[model samples]
Target: IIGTYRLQLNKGFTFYDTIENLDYFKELGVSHLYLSPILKARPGSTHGYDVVDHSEINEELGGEEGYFKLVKEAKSRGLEIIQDIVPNHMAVHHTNWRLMDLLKSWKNSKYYNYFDHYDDDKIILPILEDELDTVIDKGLIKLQKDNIEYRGLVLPINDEGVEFLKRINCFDNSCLKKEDIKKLLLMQYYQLTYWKKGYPNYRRFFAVNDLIAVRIELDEVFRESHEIIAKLPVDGLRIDHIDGLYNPKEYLDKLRQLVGNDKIIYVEKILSINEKLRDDWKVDGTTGYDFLNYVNMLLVDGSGEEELTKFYENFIGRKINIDELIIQSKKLVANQLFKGDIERLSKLLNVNYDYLVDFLACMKKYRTYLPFEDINGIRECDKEGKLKDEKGIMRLQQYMPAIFAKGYEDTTLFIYNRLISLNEVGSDLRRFSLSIEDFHNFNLSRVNTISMNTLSTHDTKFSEDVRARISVLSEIPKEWEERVKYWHDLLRPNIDKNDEYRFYQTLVGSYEGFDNKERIKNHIIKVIREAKVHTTWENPNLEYEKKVLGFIDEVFENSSFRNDFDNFEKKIVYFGYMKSLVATTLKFLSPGVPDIYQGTEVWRFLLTDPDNRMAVDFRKLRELLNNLTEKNLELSDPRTKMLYVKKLLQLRREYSLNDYKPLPFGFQRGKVTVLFSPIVTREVKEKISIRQKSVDWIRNEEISSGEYNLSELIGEHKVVILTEK
Candidate 1:
């Protein structure tokens, strides 16, 4: 059954709230209620990726009673509950104080083996002297002597270490003192500071010191960590950061054994284009970001390429190769960015620099695109402004050639640019670029397909809608360029000198100033970071952030200042609707399981994190649903997408599941647009006429004449047939 409404339950909606909404969900043809992690997580976490406790339901989410009530309600309405499961890491703030006490006791603890350590043997503590004099003249590293100290061990630090020590404020630990450094080491390690031996290393997923990975395959750990979820009446599981685990397939196998094979499982395994999931393991598919690329491509206007290219070439006073420029821009991310954060993390974990480097390298290499440049550009703009000097402009120019190349023609690219302009700095944007190869890896049948995708995710950067608006800016470059120039002129009148002009110009170019892209980006980043730090299950930020996000909502809704704002909005909305229809159609018919994101069904135009996490206005959605129900729309070859999706999903649930046939799939052009089809039955052998004269179908045929069948395709998104009709 096709599950609908992957309800993010923690965003302020309780289990009881979900239970209350059962009738509403049923009306929408929802067969399953896909819930975010209902296990005890850090409080007030809307997207429950940061699970703190695995054994109990978050009391704030209605505890055990609340969860049971939700399950009972769901079952009563014939809605299966699919609980999101996190096997990778736990929230740092989890209240397993007893286990933590044992862990602190080190070798004396019986449960030490349950947690990942450097080796099979527990190494002695105080492995290094706290104050080691190196060639450089720096202060000694202090040691913390406390019962709660990690591993109850002390290690060494030289001047270089001292510098980091100062930066990290390690000495600020209440028990830490310069004189106690050596003695503390001895007390913890049972050896004198200088006499201590062996390397001090620890095993962790990344630099997140608190989020230690558990050996989930171990019987005891498996049972303890997953017991609540396995027994719960949830319908599916969304495994967060599966890469952090020792072996994903092993974990999946165990989960399947416990939960049953039919339970839907989706993992956050950001696979590259060439990568493939273990064939032996069973899963419904990914959570659908891989399919989001189709949305990106469809929204981008191809016609703006020439104008954008010409504008940039003249603007830069050099012939720029857009593709190479993208590569070079991506290199900036590899060389200068995110590395520092990883390096700091490496030191905290007492691991080699290469460890952090490898982790970051994987993150970088695996992505479909590099959103870091856009992120960095926003920063640069916040500091500098829109109009840059030769050098500054050159730096900014390298990052967004696709935007520059396609912005004028593509409505999506244009909006993306504008949003970038709004929050040039302080967006704290992280790039989550996906490629066609990544898409193929997630859905293998479309290996050779060109998947247009994005760099930011639901967790980072601006929301997809904000990005969409920025994308629209790319389609109207002349107008955009003029607006930038006009803004520059407006600022010029207030400036006394050329230096001031240059400075402000850079600021404008970068998206500084109040009520602009830079300010908006900065505000978004600040709010999200704050929300992450402050809110938890015990201290939910639903009411608090709601007020803050209201301000943001106003900003995003009314922030634009271009002369053609209304026209732009209209054009973008039109393109947005068309793109959504085209992309959704392509996704379903393509050679992969068209995974749908939660709340993307009806115009999801919001920014990252809290914005993306905002409670989906299901009331509006309900209205749309009501209209569709009343219309009695025809199912065969739907015109409007809302109708098409409803019909297609219904058809898929009824006839598509058991099919193992592959149908002839291709695209054809219509008089005004292009048409895509996924032919399903081999018996229906006929030629379908091409709509547009110049449009090329998949195999370059006006009419694809062949025995059509949907059952030939199986696994992932390939065409599949159920049985001979």
Candidate 2:
């Protein structure tokens, strides 16, 4: 495929909603419609990763009829479809049939071995708000029909428990007392403990107890779970959380056999720095966190790192050891949040839990597949190379990714506020920027692969445009430092100094206007909680959160802060827009097949998860596309970005874009030569020689085979493509 467009499917925007926008995507020049998870998920699931049933399409997304309709319409427009599949886990909800069966019958259930459970007959569910005794005393759990309810979640009780309850003359909710209910619950195949206090026997997705890991390594389990995906009429599949699987390589092999060679497969793999995707995995490429981090780092200037670090330390009033802080954060979650998983692994390996915790905390990357691979991180974690049990090794591999995600991406990324833009997925905090030479070399290394190169995805910390704006701060440290100090002094709200600094950067990065007070507050609350500094999601400090919200209100309502902020924001936005265009140009021209997130063709300044996944204005987008044929172009208007994207895509189809070569100003692919004015702070004017007669794609002008002024061709436009005339 030349290009792909990702569409987030939810109840709000169903398959029918996407069917309406088929023509828009076809006009946008994408070759395939890459969809999010479409299998039946838990009710009200906005993102479909928590899939409950793989045998059917999600009813909330209009089910099989609507999905087939979308496929037919897209196929009619010569666009193939790529469906995102979740093969690792399922939602822990009442609608999950396999889970319900396991709860009711224990080892007698037909699907008892479907999930990865311990040797214990009873599974522990940490879903209660208080201790079991306290919950029973308070009468929080109630029996309704054949099920028991607690915290609004219903669980099926075993037949033995039901029979015992009937014998006690307290079978129904009308006559049951707290003591009688407790006795009945103990007779069941499952145990309910306090939400924050439990040693569950099952694996979870990260520290999220609501999603349970499945035993897909079993042949029967694999076949039963993938019956629908194997038969779906789509071009490819995008696997979510590939590292979470017990044996990713073997699992991919099974998937390859099931789907056959006609289908393409891409894993959502997060490659660390200098780590390459293994060629023997029977897959095409990753979902492109590598490309996202590379492009994001390229735009950040390294010269300002020293000054930026100095100001950050001055503001926080302490020197931070980034590496030490990362280890501390990892250990924090390993001991508190993921204590159960560590305990299980330690028992399997026959070692102390503390040893396993320390080893996991020191893991640099996500995981190591081979047991005896002498990699730095894994070898250092197990210095003696004594972890020889293959089963134990496999379990450790499966558990490390969760710790890395929860500890680094969710926890450490929030605390390390030196350069928040650099603290993205698949990025190292110590690595500030990528050199132009290194960027070219990285592209050369991936020339043989078909990875999806992207700048923004649903999981990005913020939108590409917002990151671009923040990257401008890396080039002007002094100005940014002064403005931040000014804002904090003018409207000083009672909050942590470190948090205050982070708040200023967030405002400058994502500030379109003063209308996003609620969005900003929600983002900060999530940020601080994830940081695990003053409050958290499990046990929130309402008083501290209220103060943080008040701080945001002050930032928005204070006239002096707003006036000073708007003035400084103008300069950042100007340079930032230029950087965004350059980043967009590189994404399309790079070595891989570029993937565009929904509605990002125009300017998008969104924040993480819920904010980034908001509804798209496709009606307005189609209107803009219709008006593009008229020969009016304005750089200030976002429609120009859309037009540029369309033109690049059309050129990609008309040209091979192979045979990469590095140029002084930019890079060349076959007959297509890309040039850019890299300096975003000021306009550039230079005289350059050309070897062939070419047409400037952006400016629509012809150039002779001789010297030409760069400024005349590029002007204020940051990037230009030259095709041989």
Candidate 3:
């Protein structure tokens, strides 16, 4: 695919809704329509990641009929479909017929071994508000003829349990007394416990109690779960959370065989700093956090990192170490958030639980596929007799990804606010900035790669434009330090120390000139809870959140804060647009397939999810794309970036950019040479040589080859592309 556009599919924007945007996407110059998950998910699920059934399309998302209609429509427009599939886990709701059957029939169910669970007569479901006896006394759980209803959940009961309940004088919705309920519960195959006290016996998706992990490594499980996916008339598949699988390579090999060799496959893989994608896997490439972090780092100025670090440390009143924080945060998650997983491995291997927690906390990478790679240090330890049990090591590999995701991505990223833009997923928090020379080398290595190059996605913490604006602060560290210090002194609210630093950066990065106090408040609430410093999602401190929210109102209401912020934000916004356009151009010219997130073709100033996932006004964007012209060429207009992007994509169709040639401060791909101004705050002067005469692609002006001043050619736009004349 030349370029792909990703759309988040939900009940709000179903398949029919996406069908309406087909013409808009074709006009926007995207070659493929990359959609979110379409499997049968739990009812009322916003994101389709909580899938319950793999054999059918989501009924709410227009089901099989709607999906086929969409495919036909897209094919008519010469557009292909890439469906996102979730094979790692499924929801644990009543809608999951297989899970419910397993609960009702226990060992007799065909899917009894479908999920990863320990050998137990009963499994724990941690959904109760209190202890089972307390909930029974409160009349929260009621017995029905063939099932039990608690709150809004319906759990199936076996025939034996139903008969026992009937014998105890219980009927449809009539079991009220504690003795009757307790007696009926003992006869069931599942146990209900208080949410805080129970750690489920079955594996879950990153400590989420409502989503259970599946045993896809088994042949029967893989065939049953992937039947519909294999038959779908789509061009490719994008696997969600491939790291969660027991054997990623083996699973991909099976999928390749099932889907035939013509279909393209991309894994949602996160590579560490020095990690490279395996060449032998039956896949095209990753969904591209590698390219995202590379482009993000190039926009940052390294010279200011020392000054910025000092100022931030002073504000927080402590010296921060990212490496140390990662270990601590990971250990905390293993001990508390994922204690059940730790305990299971401990019992399985007859090892100490505390040592296992420590072992998991020190994992350098997400996981290592056994017998092939040993990047996670597991094999070395095993050879040394440090961990002699093979099953214990395999369990550790399965559990490492969740521990890293919760501890590093969710927890540590929120606390380390030194340079918020550098704290993204797949980002190296220890590395402040990337050198231009290093970036060119990185590009050279991707000459033949088909990996997607992306800047913003549904999972990104902030939008491309927001990060672009924050990157400008790196160019003027002292000024940024002074401005934030003034804001803190002006309010002097009772917020947490790290939270105060993070909030100021968030406001400066995400300000789009309106009373966005509510949006900012919502984002900050998630931030504090994610950080788990003073509040958390599991057990929240409403009092602290209220104070923090009130402080946001105080900041917005203050005349001095608003005026000063507007002045500083105006300057940042001015440089931000130019920098973002440069980043956008780099994505197209770089050696990869460019992927544009929905609604990000223009200026999208957004924060984390639910905020980032807001509905896109395609009607307005369509109008803008239809009327683009020379009049929209000004840097101040939002349509300028869209027009520029359209031109680059159109040029891509006619040029071959498969070969990468590194220059002093640019790259030469086939007949095109792309140069960029790395720093936005100051003028850069450099001498560069092109092998031949070329025409400036953006301006349509002829240029003679010998030697040229890079700054003069780039001018004020910060980026320039030259094609062979």
Candidate 4:
């Protein structure tokens, strides 16, 4: 039911657009169209993450009528839509009426308690050009007559704001005094500052100054936020950033009861090594990054780990102690992005920011539920707050992991990529290749139905083919090194020293066809920014983008470049295909429901966001698949692969087997034999067994619990579904 809601620019695919393809989804057999946020968002906000009006369906995307048509068409097509709701925050843009109501009315506004504002009369907007005095003197802070929500605009925090709004009423959006605006702003609540100056324990989705967190614990706020989602029928929900909530368990519990018991629910929970979802939360399971990483790991060849390690270390001008970088990366992110949070926590605890920041950066996983639980860190920043199991530490600590995830996991992860595949969302190269026995045991420990096992989603850094091709570099290290040497020898003259290292990682991952040059260049730009070694979101260095992008453009010009690059992609791709087939086979046919990311059934080699979310040529894909035959398996065409996926998915619906069991295939693992029958109830499988002990398994596969090797079945048949007979 989880069909991707892809957006192009701010004009998203309309609900009528979805209705146009209703039969396409109906044919895919997804039970529901798990859609993205469809609320009114900031202008030109492509992903629909920025919500200005949650109550209104996006007028840009066919408004109310279009949405009704989509729902009606989908309902008739036998598929329901489980909408993606954002309760954590709203678009901080001036256009958000709900926010503007609070801005103008402050404490007097009926919706004043809606946001996380405290201890300040005027919210520190923090988006100033210089200071309040200079901005007002320049007359930059004025009203936009057409856009009444940001009615008194200039946003300069001086007393002049009073005159501006007074004029709006008295002189009709026309007259104001500097002092009147200042005093009027004071009358309004929530002081806007440099955005970083923190206010108590208020947290955000990250360092974004505008996307402020909501006060969902307040009943009025919670009800208002969830009004739409709670009313949807024949469906469930995917809670984005579940970690951002004060008490995730409590929040979901309240939310589940709000929706009642008839529907299903899943949280976007990120587990560390062996962390499991709390059973009492009443949710189905995680959105499956853990499963994604586990399946991705199976495709990466661990034999070349040493070779790639040397490659990254050499480029960095020094050896990278991965453990150290992990710590350092998280710290850097917190210090730069969450500076306001750190300073506030430090002030409350009456200590330097270093201690508090260090404690959070040192955590092995994302933040924990119980700060008092004491896993990695024991130091308390707010002594008065956290000392006696106080409320302050619990509130602040819950936000720390989300902070840590953004600062450390998302930022630092790209910086420390040796085997890029191992650097995936839930993967840690430190864990090594997961054994088949360990995988099943991990599933057995789950509290819900197996889960929607996946490899790539919208959030992935690279597509499956991109990662799959790059993973091959680990298998053929010496050759990969030579190719790297050649590429550098060719482009290094033009490429700057700062971008040289990034080029290696990006080129290897994104070495696509010549036609995709623009996509490849855009991919590199985002990749470099994400690394943030010398550039970032707030302070982007044009020199780096220019150097890298220009280099990417010129590379296609070299005739030898086109000819030689062919061999490099050629060498790794066949093995890449092996990994892709096996990985896809295992996911679709494995425990739990399987999800196929929109364009992933074929070759998905590109970057993240718009790049990964590029429109699919489904018509071409359908045609290729129609012509597919056993005679064309060895061709580089996408048909053979799509056929494999199609048959497996088609076969999966009939059996509805119970329990997953593993069988041995020589020395390796991965031969699954599930008991299949037409008449059995859909609630399938209990415990899957093998020669190795299922419980208390470890890194050493020799002392393993599972005996089966799924590889033999996958390797010989090329597709698991093909061998089903």
Candidate 5:
């Protein structure tokens, strides 16, 4: 497996930024430099998920020459380069706006069949038809008389059209000559219609509008889009939004043919809870978030599950039905946010409203993070109430408040309830979120494991460290409850009032408390909202604006809960540190490829999107690495988590990849679970003979279990023994 570091770039931070830091990645034992799309994307975007032009590298991110330079440098260091290629949809704001225009005029266009359109030949717009008519009915479009232009049809308005003309404006600039206005409106109308008919209107994985599905079933379109990527000297290709393609198998086969057999390809394809990889696809595997689930489960404390659940229920003074809560929360999002965008887009494309709604609904269901717990907890009670669930009560007990206290508390409570539900249901389906068994089953060969085993990335609700803390909630609920209660009692009066917006604001703001509060808050709010309402692959401004507004809503609504912020922060930080250690250990030891997300080696507690994609302070991480190297310690030693990571990585690099051989795994005392995977070599047999220990004595005899006792074994370096031949 090629170890890679994925970098998402923005303005001022180009391919040169990665080139400048090539040595650092080399030192970290990374075999490849996996980059987010380097293609020309919307301006100011850090994560290049939006591609405006597939043929060229984004000038803002160091253009073609700069990219070539990065490739050269990576190769010089014996590191491969992996480009993230998108096969789905072209950016809505592609340099060739005429394509959009053609789509708008869907009836006749040479490129009509290239897009994934519904049978009606209408594109799906996100707003209501009336809203679009408002733009069309008024003289919203501007026509200018031009003498010379390259494309013949000159788009006179440029950025001004979107910023001033399309949006709510300062003045009524609806006075235009009838002919000019008609021409402009016709163009706008054509653009909308073409998009509906010419583009894929299916729901993106996470309500991402720019991620339109591609009709890869057509060989020509796939070749044009993916051919350039195949020509790159990169060692592998990280396929972005693989699910958004019409035929994954056909696309993979085509990619394999173009890139040759040796190239390692990992896709961003999410397997359903019980789904498995298709046999026909000839690719390496996924990008490893599923593996992260196993790592998380290993670190959690099972015995504390029940205690945490009751504590949270009592603390909230309301019973929470997680599934029902999720359904309700989705209903709110649909009514308040998604519906408007769908209607607007549908009208522009002249498609049915149900098409857009269904698209949005599908995306919501596949979210990596579950927001229901936090949303439900915040809704149930104000900050002044005693903590509910083991983790929540524990945070209050210890007089510690953290950025995601509400979320952590709720999830902890849910985990306990979920365990019980699993028992009653007689099925192992996950009740809270994604489960480990499902994750393992999805990628049985462990080839695509790393793609799903992500910690921190451009798309996460919280940092890996923060989530790691929450994982601890599965272990020590009662103690955590008491600690939470104490902390809540101490900070209750000082905290700002709990309200929807304020709750979200504090949740975001708390992460920034350790760094730049305003900047972090702004980044967090902007990213979240962007995740919500962004339509089109291009246009970072709209996304940034949306996130900012979301944050404002959160903060303004809960400014009164300010007092509890520090306490919550402290507790989460402590747990964050602990979880980081555990997560790192598990990541390195897991069966699949382990990816160390960019800038996560030291610490990453930032919020979603632009914030998560912000420029990383690698200097601190470098210094930490140097210190750890000097001391010869592991990065995640708990005593030295950073150093422990270094050691684990070094060892992993030296050793050959280990296969997931099922030895034995079982539950003991209905509380403790034992898992054993044996690595038997000829040497093991020789050693056994020298020691004279019987197979049963060495295997079954050594098997032992106790509630919350795995930590002791892990700490002591004792491997559980499985039956020997």
Candidate 6:
């Protein structure tokens, strides 16, 4: 598959920055280069997901010229560039000209309908400091000549603010009335709301008020927002949160018409446990979440789910139904964050919003209102005349995207305590494992291979290697518990009953062993808040969190305990390294284009974003690759994955397979090599160029498992096993 990378513009990483690393990727043998979003995001969006405007490449990311240069370089190197595009949303604040115009020009502004709630007279901007009058008195939000923005709030223009526009329109100072801008602001078409109260009122992306959903269903908005995207030299569109669209199919159809039908496309879409990609969307399959889940599941032992669940339940002293937790969590988001979304849907349905709440709350999957295969309820509500006929049904279908955008992605994703890996993008927490046969059937049944097959993307909760280690616990249940108990006994007295479970969970979750005290402490805090079980950002348990933080320091200071942690982790890391070998092998050998995320060549010990995006040390990577001649090395070294990856890719490029089929290496362990190709030959294996780097070579006859040492195949680690033919 292609190598997908999250290139953050800030932190000294830009399009120009990537040009320097091109040779490294070229040597790695990945054929395509995929980068994260490139549009101008909000003033300083590190992730680039909060797209401010799509008309241009983010100037911070080196603008249009920089984009062209990267593309030109990629093409010259025989690599194609694929982009991650934000078509369904935009940031609603400070820099957005539409939001600015809506404030001053009010209903008269031509761009008034650019954001949501066009029929509403007052645009509710959640941008005031203290009370609205206080902020008005303090002049924090007073009108300026250009725009009014402050307090991490979102806003647009209104009617009353328009009348005074005439008085303030004087170009010459002597001719001007010079009325109070705050007074004019109060007069504007948009009303201001408390920052926390923006929910259910301001059109938002998830629980975030300043990030607004775009009405891309309108053809004008779609074309206007994709200006830079259309000009870029990319081969595919990776739609960020495709379910955020009102009619995803319609959006894709229209988008295809703009970019050209031949261009490949993918959506950041998650399927239901049994759901398949919608073939009618006319895009290549999802941005590899389906394949990600299967490949990740291959390394997980399914039998651990029961023991893990029981242990978690015992730790929490409650039998938790994660399904119900998901349901309630969505409701919690609705009641607290997205109440207005459902209310608007209710008004259109001509029913009370509360009635629709059950319809939404009862949803079992990410969205669906659960129709199509369903014994439907909300879909059943259409039979009642309360809905506004066919128009209402169309809007009704839109609710899932809203629920997914507002409820699931925002809130339910947090607090999902079962298997955190199950919480990955487009994966279901309940669907814990997959058999080789399941993967085989999927590849055979799939529609397109142009999509990505990935184990880790920037959005994943844990890195591929870290998750691989955690999966090993699934096969080592009792020892995993013993280890968990070791940490629990050390910290239990300091943490509360509710928080104790989180402590162990976080310990295991970020279990690669800490680099520094603060790193582990922050991860603990991040995990606790994300779990949202005992603590949350909305209503945080600060005192309990304080105790947990204090307890973290104690564990590190005790050298005896820390030593044990290091030793125990050593075993997990080695096996995890072995699993990583299996993981990457499956990723490459499976269907779909394999995407190697940025800096994943090493043992990835990163926690989510910011951490995941940390700069790669190429010199260190080079040293590991340079050490290939050394004997009997640690499998966890970055070179183990990199060398094998290079060899396999070179082999695949040389010999095109007619059809990829899985070979069962039944009930075998310790670097079992399942040779798939009937064309495999000892003569050819000895002739391949990697044979020079093999360090050891042998010709074994009548062999099966461990017949020939992998040291002879690809040295330094037993994980790399293959032959070229």
- State every prediction's TM-score relative to the real structure: 0.58, 0.97, 0.97, 0.84, 0.66, 0.85
Off by over 4 Å in 6: 1-6, 137-139, 142-182, 200-202, 368-388, 402-421, 509-514, 622-632, 666-721
Model 4: residues >4 Å from true position, as ranges? 1-10, 128-140, 144-202, 348-352, 371-389, 444-448, 494-498, 618-635, 665-719, 722-725
Candidate 5: tens digits of C-alpha lDDT, residues 280-367:
6687777765554444444454555567667767654556666444334344444443454445455554545654333333332232
Q: What's model 2's lDDT at 307?
A: 95
What 10-residue stretch in candidate 4 is worst by lDDT?
Answer: 675-684
Assess the local accuracy of residue 110 in candidate 5 as a C-alpha lDDT between 0 and 100.
Answer: 55
Q: Which ten residues in a row have the lowest lDDT in candidate 1?
A: 405-414
Candidate 2 worst ten-residue window by lDDT: 370-379
Q: Which sequence of candidate numbers ranks them by lDDT, best first?
A: 3, 2, 6, 4, 5, 1
Candidate 5 global lDDT: 0.49
Clash number by candidate, in order:
101, 0, 0, 41, 97, 14
Clashing pairs in 3: none
Q: What would the per-residue lDDT of candidate 6 be over residues 1-725, giving only the tens digit for each residue?
A: 44454444542678888787777777777776778788887766677888776677888878888889988987788777778888766776656776667656756767667766535666675744466666655645534343455565444434444445655673222443334654655566667766765543545656566677777878787778877788777877788877666677788888888889877787887776677666567888776777877767766677787898788677656776767776776676666665777778777777877667766666555554222323343445334435444556555555565565445554555555555545555656656777766666776655237667788878776677767766767776777778767777765556654455544544554665555667667766776676565687767889878988888777767776678777777766666676777677666655566777777866767666656777777667666666753234456656657766666565547544335544342111112233221111111132222221221211222232233432344332323443332
Q: Tell me how far the alpha carbon of residue 401 in candidate 4 is from the true structure, in angstroms, after superposition.
A: 2.6
**Tens-digit lDDT track for model 1 on 484-560?**
45444443332112222222222222231234454445443343332233332224556644544454444335435
lDDT of 3 by residue, 1-725 (tens): 68889999989999999999999888788888999999999887888999889888999999999999999999999899988999989998888999999999989999998988776688888989898988888888877788888888999988888778667665755444678678788778888889899989888888888888899999999999998998899999999998888888889999999998888788898888787877678899889899999989999999999999899889889898998998899988888789878887878867788777776777677776664565345644333345656656666678888988888888898989998978888887878888888898888788888889999999988888888989999999999988988888888889777888888888878987748578889999999999888999889999999999888888888999999999998889889887898899999889988988998999888898879988988889999998887552668676878876787887788899888988777788889988888788798778877668898887777888887787887877788999997
Model 3 misplaced regions, further than 4 Å: 374-376, 379-384, 689-693, 704-707
- In lDDT terms, how accurate is model 4? 0.62
Roughly what TM-score does model 4 have, to 2 decimal places? 0.84
Task: Report residue 545 deviation for candidate 3 (angstroms).
Answer: 1.4
> Across residues 120-190, which tens digit of lDDT does each residue of candidate 4 receive?
46566665544555555555555443222232432222234445464556422246566644445454444
What is candidate 5's TM-score against the reference?
0.66
